[PDB]
């Protein structure tokens, strides 16, 4: 499913993402926007290393979820990558929480550095009532 901006904002807040490990809700919104365009079924194969990015946060199969065809992969979130393709984003959120628990935090996603870091991200949550 493709979330509408404010609908996603309110959903993320309810799931406890606001301020998680120091990360504001607007940053998570900026991340989802640039990673998948708020689309839970988005998948992206990386031909260069044989890994695939799954879901709304484009979480990688090499470290976070298991899809069985990625070489030398671990499953830190202890989930099938299929779980990251559901309309219900509860599992994707729990895995994103795990990702940022590592030292890099939100910087783990390069797109965040490119389009969110040091920017005015207020626009992603404006008018959503969160």
CATH number for the domain spanning 18: value is: 1.10.530.10
Distance CA 124, CA 96 (A): 18
Looking at the structure of the chain, the number of domains it has is: 1
HSE-CB for 92 with a 13 A CA cutoff: 27
Handedness of CA 46, 50, 51, 55 (dihedral sign): positive
Name 97's Cβ contacts closer than 8 Å, sequence gap at least 6. Answer: 17, 20, 21
Distances (CA, A) of 53 to 39, 67, 101, 118: 12, 10, 19, 25
Tell me if 73 sits within 8 A of 61, measured CB to CB: yes
> 5 is in which domain, residue-wise?
1-130
Tell me if 8 sits within 8 A of 38, measured CB to CB: yes
The one-character DSSP state at 107 is G
Tell me if 124 sits within 8 A of 32, measured CB to CB: no
Catalytic residues, by residue number, are 35, 53
């Amino acid at each position: 499913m493709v979330f509408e901006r404010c609908e996603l904002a309110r959903t993320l807040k309810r799931l406890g993402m606001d301020g998680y490990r120091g990360i504001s809700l607007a940053n998570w919104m900026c991340l989802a926007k640039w990673e998948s365009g708020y689309n839970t079924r988005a998948t992206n194969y990386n031909a260069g290393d044989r890994s695939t990015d799954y879901g709304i946060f484009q979480i990688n199969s090499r470290y976070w979820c298991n899809d069985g065809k990625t070489p030398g992969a671990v499953n830190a979130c202890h989930l099938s990558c299929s779980a990251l393709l559901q309309d219900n984003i509860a599992d994707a959120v729990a895995c994103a929480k795990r990702v940022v628990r590592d030292p890099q935090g939100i910087r783990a996603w390069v797109a965040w550095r490119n389009r969110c870091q040091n920017r005015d991200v207020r626009q992603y949550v404006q008018g959503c009532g969160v």
